[PDB]
Amino acid sequence: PQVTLWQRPLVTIKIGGQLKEALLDTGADNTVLEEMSLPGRWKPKMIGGIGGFIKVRQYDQILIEICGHKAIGTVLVGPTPVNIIGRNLLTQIGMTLNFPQVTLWQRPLVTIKIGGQLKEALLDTGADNTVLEEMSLPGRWKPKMIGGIGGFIKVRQYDQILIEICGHKAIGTVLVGPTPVNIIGRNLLTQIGATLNF
């Protein structure tokens, strides 16, 4: 199947005998599910994201069937706002990002040019919005709060910003604030024709 990004790329998963929906998330190293019943031993772990950190339970060698494709790997369970399938499992179901084709054995980073400046950013299918670390941008902006795995951050919202993503021009909203990593979200991914294929 090929997946465009005008809507969140949600799939049905089966894990621990249970059916859930989850987000195919190229921006996530790891797979993180909301609190759920799983069997067996687990290890405590802290993971970070926009908003800060959360404590999770790490389960290893968990079988998960993602859109009918079987994968085995590590699953983290804890207070994430959304179930996310990260690259540790996306690689097992043959997931690629197309806009150039991009496998997901490494973070899908691209070079962007924005506000006259060159930056690196993560192609993030799990992100509705585009969020960049603190930077100098020209013009008016509006305060906004956005949420993520660890809670919320305050950002500055700039509209009608031109970004050149891997040489492809897009115009749209860019949020600027204390994100750990520069993220290109679906609002711009759709403009460069990005698809998810597995």
Side-chain angles (χ1 to χ4, degrees), residues 159-182:
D159 294 337
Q160 306 164 292
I161 296 302
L162 171 69
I163 299 192
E164 188 156 5
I165 300 164
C166 205
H168 294 254
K169 293 170 201 158
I171 294 190
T173 295
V174 173
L175 313 176
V176 179
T179 173
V181 295
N182 295 322

PDB file of all heavy atoms in Angstrom, residues 159-182:
ATOM      1  N   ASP A 159       2.919  32.313   9.671  1.00  0.00           N
ATOM      2  CA  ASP A 159       2.165  31.840   8.521  1.00  0.00           C
ATOM      3  C   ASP A 159       2.831  32.276   7.224  1.00  0.00           C
ATOM      4  O   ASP A 159       3.616  33.231   7.187  1.00  0.00           O
ATOM      5  CB  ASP A 159       0.724  32.353   8.565  1.00  0.00           C
ATOM      6  CG  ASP A 159      -0.063  31.775   9.719  1.00  0.00           C
ATOM      7  OD1 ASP A 159       0.307  30.695  10.224  1.00  0.00           O
ATOM      8  OD2 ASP A 159      -1.062  32.399  10.118  1.00  0.00           O
ATOM      9  N   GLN A 160       2.519  31.534   6.155  1.00  0.00           N
ATOM     10  CA  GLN A 160       2.938  31.876   4.796  1.00  0.00           C
ATOM     11  C   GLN A 160       4.455  32.031   4.705  1.00  0.00           C
ATOM     12  O   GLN A 160       4.977  32.976   4.100  1.00  0.00           O
ATOM     13  CB  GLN A 160       2.202  33.126   4.316  1.00  0.00           C
ATOM     14  CG  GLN A 160       0.705  32.956   4.459  1.00  0.00           C
ATOM     15  CD  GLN A 160      -0.046  34.270   4.367  1.00  0.00           C
ATOM     16  OE1 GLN A 160       0.056  35.121   5.253  1.00  0.00           O
ATOM     17  NE2 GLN A 160      -0.802  34.444   3.289  1.00  0.00           N
ATOM     18  N   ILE A 161       5.160  31.078   5.317  1.00  0.00           N
ATOM     19  CA  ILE A 161       6.616  31.031   5.324  1.00  0.00           C
ATOM     20  C   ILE A 161       7.067  30.145   4.178  1.00  0.00           C
ATOM     21  O   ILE A 161       6.577  29.025   4.038  1.00  0.00           O
ATOM     22  CB  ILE A 161       7.137  30.477   6.660  1.00  0.00           C
ATOM     23  CG1 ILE A 161       6.755  31.407   7.806  1.00  0.00           C
ATOM     24  CG2 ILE A 161       8.652  30.280   6.607  1.00  0.00           C
ATOM     25  CD1 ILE A 161       7.279  32.796   7.642  1.00  0.00           C
ATOM     26  N   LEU A 162       8.025  30.628   3.386  1.00  0.00           N
ATOM     27  CA  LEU A 162       8.606  29.822   2.319  1.00  0.00           C
ATOM     28  C   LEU A 162       9.722  28.945   2.877  1.00  0.00           C
ATOM     29  O   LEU A 162      10.628  29.446   3.554  1.00  0.00           O
ATOM     30  CB  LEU A 162       9.154  30.728   1.218  1.00  0.00           C
ATOM     31  CG  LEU A 162       9.974  30.025   0.134  1.00  0.00           C
ATOM     32  CD1 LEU A 162       9.065  29.142  -0.725  1.00  0.00           C
ATOM     33  CD2 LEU A 162      10.722  31.036  -0.720  1.00  0.00           C
ATOM     34  N   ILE A 163       9.652  27.645   2.601  1.00  0.00           N
ATOM     35  CA  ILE A 163      10.700  26.692   2.958  1.00  0.00           C
ATOM     36  C   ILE A 163      11.054  25.883   1.722  1.00  0.00           C
ATOM     37  O   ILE A 163      10.172  25.468   0.964  1.00  0.00           O
ATOM     38  CB  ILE A 163      10.287  25.728   4.093  1.00  0.00           C
ATOM     39  CG1 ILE A 163       9.953  26.460   5.378  1.00  0.00           C
ATOM     40  CG2 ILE A 163      11.408  24.765   4.382  1.00  0.00           C
ATOM     41  CD1 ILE A 163       9.832  25.493   6.565  1.00  0.00           C
ATOM     42  N   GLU A 164      12.337  25.650   1.515  1.00  0.00           N
ATOM     43  CA  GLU A 164      12.774  24.772   0.443  1.00  0.00           C
ATOM     44  C   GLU A 164      13.302  23.520   1.126  1.00  0.00           C
ATOM     45  O   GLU A 164      14.314  23.576   1.833  1.00  0.00           O
ATOM     46  CB  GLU A 164      13.812  25.448  -0.453  1.00  0.00           C
ATOM     47  CG  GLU A 164      14.156  24.634  -1.693  1.00  0.00           C
ATOM     48  CD  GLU A 164      14.689  25.480  -2.832  1.00  0.00           C
ATOM     49  OE1 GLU A 164      14.883  26.702  -2.637  1.00  0.00           O
ATOM     50  OE2 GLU A 164      14.903  24.918  -3.928  1.00  0.00           O
ATOM     51  N   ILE A 165      12.574  22.418   0.955  1.00  0.00           N
ATOM     52  CA  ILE A 165      12.813  21.139   1.616  1.00  0.00           C
ATOM     53  C   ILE A 165      13.450  20.192   0.615  1.00  0.00           C
ATOM     54  O   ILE A 165      12.787  19.743  -0.321  1.00  0.00           O
ATOM     55  CB  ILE A 165      11.495  20.544   2.158  1.00  0.00           C
ATOM     56  CG1 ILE A 165      10.854  21.487   3.177  1.00  0.00           C
ATOM     57  CG2 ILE A 165      11.730  19.150   2.749  1.00  0.00           C
ATOM     58  CD1 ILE A 165       9.400  21.173   3.470  1.00  0.00           C
ATOM     59  N   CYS A 166      14.736  19.920   0.792  1.00  0.00           N
ATOM     60  CA  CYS A 166      15.465  19.056  -0.122  1.00  0.00           C
ATOM     61  C   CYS A 166      15.322  19.552  -1.571  1.00  0.00           C
ATOM     62  O   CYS A 166      15.291  18.759  -2.508  1.00  0.00           O
ATOM     63  CB  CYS A 166      14.969  17.612   0.031  1.00  0.00           C
ATOM     64  SG  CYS A 166      16.252  16.455  -0.493  1.00  0.00           S
ATOM     65  N   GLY A 167      15.205  20.869  -1.739  1.00  0.00           N
ATOM     66  CA  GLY A 167      15.166  21.469  -3.063  1.00  0.00           C
ATOM     67  C   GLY A 167      13.767  21.680  -3.615  1.00  0.00           C
ATOM     68  O   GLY A 167      13.597  22.127  -4.749  1.00  0.00           O
ATOM     69  N   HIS A 168      12.762  21.354  -2.810  1.00  0.00           N
ATOM     70  CA  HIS A 168      11.360  21.480  -3.194  1.00  0.00           C
ATOM     71  C   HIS A 168      10.737  22.613  -2.394  1.00  0.00           C
ATOM     72  O   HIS A 168      10.771  22.593  -1.160  1.00  0.00           O
ATOM     73  CB  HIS A 168      10.612  20.168  -2.946  1.00  0.00           C
ATOM     74  CG  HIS A 168      11.080  19.039  -3.808  1.00  0.00           C
ATOM     75  ND1 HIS A 168      10.347  18.567  -4.875  1.00  0.00           N
ATOM     76  CD2 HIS A 168      12.218  18.307  -3.779  1.00  0.00           C
ATOM     77  CE1 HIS A 168      11.008  17.583  -5.459  1.00  0.00           C
ATOM     78  NE2 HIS A 168      12.149  17.409  -4.817  1.00  0.00           N
ATOM     79  N   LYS A 169      10.150  23.582  -3.087  1.00  0.00           N
ATOM     80  CA  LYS A 169       9.586  24.742  -2.415  1.00  0.00           C
ATOM     81  C   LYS A 169       8.188  24.454  -1.889  1.00  0.00           C
ATOM     82  O   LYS A 169       7.363  23.821  -2.556  1.00  0.00           O
ATOM     83  CB  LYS A 169       9.549  25.940  -3.357  1.00  0.00           C
ATOM     84  CG  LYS A 169      10.910  26.481  -3.754  1.00  0.00           C
ATOM     85  CD  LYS A 169      10.762  27.492  -4.869  1.00  0.00           C
ATOM     86  CE  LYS A 169      12.059  27.672  -5.643  1.00  0.00           C
ATOM     87  NZ  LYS A 169      11.786  28.232  -7.002  1.00  0.00           N
ATOM     88  N   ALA A 170       7.935  24.914  -0.673  1.00  0.00           N
ATOM     89  CA  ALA A 170       6.622  24.841  -0.054  1.00  0.00           C
ATOM     90  C   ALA A 170       6.403  26.140   0.699  1.00  0.00           C
ATOM     91  O   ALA A 170       7.362  26.822   1.074  1.00  0.00           O
ATOM     92  CB  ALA A 170       6.504  23.628   0.890  1.00  0.00           C
ATOM     93  N   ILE A 171       5.138  26.513   0.874  1.00  0.00           N
ATOM     94  CA  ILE A 171       4.781  27.690   1.662  1.00  0.00           C
ATOM     95  C   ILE A 171       3.721  27.265   2.661  1.00  0.00           C
ATOM     96  O   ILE A 171       2.739  26.619   2.284  1.00  0.00           O
ATOM     97  CB  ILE A 171       4.254  28.855   0.805  1.00  0.00           C
ATOM     98  CG1 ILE A 171       5.340  29.419  -0.102  1.00  0.00           C
ATOM     99  CG2 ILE A 171       3.714  29.962   1.709  1.00  0.00           C
ATOM    100  CD1 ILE A 171       4.928  30.710  -0.769  1.00  0.00           C
ATOM    101  N   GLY A 172       3.907  27.624   3.925  1.00  0.00           N
ATOM    102  CA  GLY A 172       2.904  27.279   4.911  1.00  0.00           C
ATOM    103  C   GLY A 172       3.305  27.755   6.286  1.00  0.00           C
ATOM    104  O   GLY A 172       4.216  28.566   6.448  1.00  0.00           O
ATOM    105  N   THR A 173       2.606  27.223   7.277  1.00  0.00           N
ATOM    106  CA  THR A 173       2.821  27.609   8.661  1.00  0.00           C
ATOM    107  C   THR A 173       4.030  26.891   9.245  1.00  0.00           C
ATOM    108  O   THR A 173       4.215  25.684   9.048  1.00  0.00           O
ATOM    109  CB  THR A 173       1.561  27.308   9.477  1.00  0.00           C
ATOM    110  OG1 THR A 173       0.501  28.144   9.000  1.00  0.00           O
ATOM    111  CG2 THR A 173       1.783  27.551  10.982  1.00  0.00           C
ATOM    112  N   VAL A 174       4.849  27.646   9.972  1.00  0.00           N
ATOM    113  CA  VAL A 174       6.020  27.126  10.666  1.00  0.00           C
ATOM    114  C   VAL A 174       5.957  27.569  12.120  1.00  0.00           C
ATOM    115  O   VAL A 174       5.842  28.768  12.400  1.00  0.00           O
ATOM    116  CB  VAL A 174       7.321  27.617  10.011  1.00  0.00           C
ATOM    117  CG1 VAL A 174       8.533  27.212  10.847  1.00  0.00           C
ATOM    118  CG2 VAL A 174       7.420  27.059   8.608  1.00  0.00           C
ATOM    119  N   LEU A 175       6.020  26.607  13.042  1.00  0.00           N
ATOM    120  CA  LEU A 175       6.098  26.898  14.465  1.00  0.00           C
ATOM    121  C   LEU A 175       7.558  26.892  14.909  1.00  0.00           C
ATOM    122  O   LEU A 175       8.350  26.058  14.459  1.00  0.00           O
ATOM    123  CB  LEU A 175       5.278  25.878  15.268  1.00  0.00           C
ATOM    124  CG  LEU A 175       3.869  25.631  14.709  1.00  0.00           C
ATOM    125  CD1 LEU A 175       3.146  24.520  15.499  1.00  0.00           C
ATOM    126  CD2 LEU A 175       3.021  26.895  14.705  1.00  0.00           C
ATOM    127  N   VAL A 176       7.912  27.840  15.777  1.00  0.00           N
ATOM    128  CA  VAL A 176       9.280  28.025  16.250  1.00  0.00           C
ATOM    129  C   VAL A 176       9.275  28.008  17.771  1.00  0.00           C
ATOM    130  O   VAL A 176       8.550  28.790  18.398  1.00  0.00           O
ATOM    131  CB  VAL A 176       9.886  29.343  15.740  1.00  0.00           C
ATOM    132  CG1 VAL A 176      11.298  29.501  16.265  1.00  0.00           C
ATOM    133  CG2 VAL A 176       9.843  29.391  14.208  1.00  0.00           C
ATOM    134  N   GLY A 177      10.073  27.123  18.364  1.00  0.00           N
ATOM    135  CA  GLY A 177      10.102  26.984  19.801  1.00  0.00           C
ATOM    136  C   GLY A 177      11.008  25.865  20.271  1.00  0.00           C
ATOM    137  O   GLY A 177      11.766  25.268  19.496  1.00  0.00           O
ATOM    138  N   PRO A 178      10.943  25.550  21.552  1.00  0.00           N
ATOM    139  CA  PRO A 178      11.889  24.616  22.167  1.00  0.00           C
ATOM    140  C   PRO A 178      11.636  23.139  21.846  1.00  0.00           C
ATOM    141  O   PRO A 178      11.579  22.289  22.737  1.00  0.00           O
ATOM    142  CB  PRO A 178      11.729  24.905  23.664  1.00  0.00           C
ATOM    143  CG  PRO A 178      10.340  25.415  23.802  1.00  0.00           C
ATOM    144  CD  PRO A 178      10.054  26.187  22.544  1.00  0.00           C
ATOM    145  N   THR A 179      11.497  22.827  20.552  1.00  0.00           N
ATOM    146  CA  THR A 179      11.483  21.423  20.164  1.00  0.00           C
ATOM    147  C   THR A 179      12.899  20.850  20.224  1.00  0.00           C
ATOM    148  O   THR A 179      13.871  21.562  19.961  1.00  0.00           O
ATOM    149  CB  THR A 179      10.923  21.261  18.752  1.00  0.00           C
ATOM    150  OG1 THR A 179      11.063  19.900  18.341  1.00  0.00           O
ATOM    151  CG2 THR A 179      11.661  22.171  17.766  1.00  0.00           C
ATOM    152  N   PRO A 180      13.046  19.570  20.585  1.00  0.00           N
ATOM    153  CA  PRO A 180      14.396  18.975  20.602  1.00  0.00           C
ATOM    154  C   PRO A 180      15.009  18.851  19.219  1.00  0.00           C
ATOM    155  O   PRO A 180      16.240  18.901  19.092  1.00  0.00           O
ATOM    156  CB  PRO A 180      14.174  17.589  21.231  1.00  0.00           C
ATOM    157  CG  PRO A 180      12.807  17.629  21.833  1.00  0.00           C
ATOM    158  CD  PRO A 180      12.018  18.622  21.048  1.00  0.00           C
ATOM    159  N   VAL A 181      14.190  18.695  18.177  1.00  0.00           N
ATOM    160  CA  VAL A 181      14.669  18.485  16.815  1.00  0.00           C
ATOM    161  C   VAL A 181      13.784  19.270  15.855  1.00  0.00           C
ATOM    162  O   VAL A 181      12.592  19.474  16.106  1.00  0.00           O
ATOM    163  CB  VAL A 181      14.681  16.982  16.432  1.00  0.00           C
ATOM    164  CG1 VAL A 181      15.683  16.207  17.287  1.00  0.00           C
ATOM    165  CG2 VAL A 181      13.309  16.380  16.598  1.00  0.00           C
ATOM    166  N   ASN A 182      14.379  19.726  14.751  1.00  0.00           N
ATOM    167  CA  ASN A 182      13.603  20.348  13.684  1.00  0.00           C
ATOM    168  C   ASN A 182      12.738  19.296  13.005  1.00  0.00           C
ATOM    169  O   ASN A 182      13.245  18.255  12.580  1.00  0.00           O
ATOM    170  CB  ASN A 182      14.526  20.984  12.639  1.00  0.00           C
ATOM    171  CG  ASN A 182      15.334  22.154  13.180  1.00  0.00           C
ATOM    172  OD1 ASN A 182      14.849  22.953  13.983  1.00  0.00           O
ATOM    173  ND2 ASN A 182      16.578  22.274  12.711  1.00  0.00           N
TER     174      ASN A 182
END
